[PDB]
Amino acid sequence: SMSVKKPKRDDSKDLALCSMILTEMETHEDAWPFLLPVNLKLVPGYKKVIKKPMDFSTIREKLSSGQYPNLETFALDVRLVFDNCETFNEDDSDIGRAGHNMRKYFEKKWTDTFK
Numbered sequence: 212s213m214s215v216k217k218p219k220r221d222d223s224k225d226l227a228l229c230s231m232i233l234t235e236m237e238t239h240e241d242a243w244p245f246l247l248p249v250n251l252k253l254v255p256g257y258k259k260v261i262k263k264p265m266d267f268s269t270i271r272e273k274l275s276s277g278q279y280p281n282l283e284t285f286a287l288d289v290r291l292v293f294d295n296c297e298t299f300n301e302d303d304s305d306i307g308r309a310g311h312n313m314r315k316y317f318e319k320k321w322t323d324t325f326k
């Protein structure tokens with residue numbers, strides 16, 4: 212509360228660590244469904260069904276222009292990519308399985324980096 216300061220973690224490296232985590236995502240071989248925004252004019256149903264589209268390049272742009280206030284909002288956009296994926300794809304499709312793989316890949320790097 213007011214004048215009651217909780218001891219807080221060092222966040223000076225958060226930007227560089229999130230950038231390196233995103234780089235590992237972008238270079239993962241299963242990252243192809245998520246590198247670029249879903250083409251709303253070439254895919255039937257996505258614009259209406261998916262109310263918050265998100266992809267790695269948009270996350271990269273928001274990270275490179277100071278649009279994430281903290282690292283929690285960064286992980287929100289990353290998880291939004293895979294939440295959208297589950298909403299729109301079957302689990303045993305190539306894209307649906309890539310999302311599950313990429314999500315598990317992310318959450319371990321998130322724990323190994325900040326926890």
Ligand SMILES: Cn1cc(C(=O)NCCN)ccc1=O
Binds near residue numbers: 299306
């Ligand atoms: C990540 N993601 C990719 C597609 C896509 O590109 N579909 C083309 C079908 N061959 C659709 C939904 C989704 O969430």
